[PDB]
Amino acid sequence: SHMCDAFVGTWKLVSSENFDDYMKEVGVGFATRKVAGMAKPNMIISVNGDVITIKSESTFKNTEISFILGQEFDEVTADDRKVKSTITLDGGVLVHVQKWDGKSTTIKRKREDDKLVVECVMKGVTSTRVYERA
Ligand X SMILES: Cc1noc(-c2c(NC(=O)[C@@H]3CCCC[C@@H]3C(=O)O)sc3c2CCCC3)n1
Q: How far, in Å, CA of 118 to CA of 130, rounded?
A: 6
Q: For binding to ligand X (CB under 6 A), which residues are involved?
A: 13, 23, 26, 28, 32, 35-36, 39, 41, 43, 56, 58, 60-61, 78-79, 107, 118, 120, 129
Indicate the residue among 87 and 129 with the shorter CB distance to ligand X.
129
Q: How far, in Å, CA of 120 to CA of 18, rounded?
A: 10
Indicate the residue among 56 and 94 with the shorter CB distance to ligand X.
56
CA nearest to 110, candidates 7, 2, 3: 7
SS3 state of residue 21? helix
CB 106 to ligand X: min, Å:
10
CB 43 to ligand X: min, Å:
5
Q: How far is CA 6 from CA 15, 50, 132, in A?
A: 20, 15, 12
* Residue 131 is labelled as binding a ligand: yes
Indicate the residue among 1 and 90 with the shorter CB distance to ligand X.
90
Please state the residue numbers annotated as binding site: 129-131
Please state the residue numbers annotated as binding site for a fatty acid: 129-131
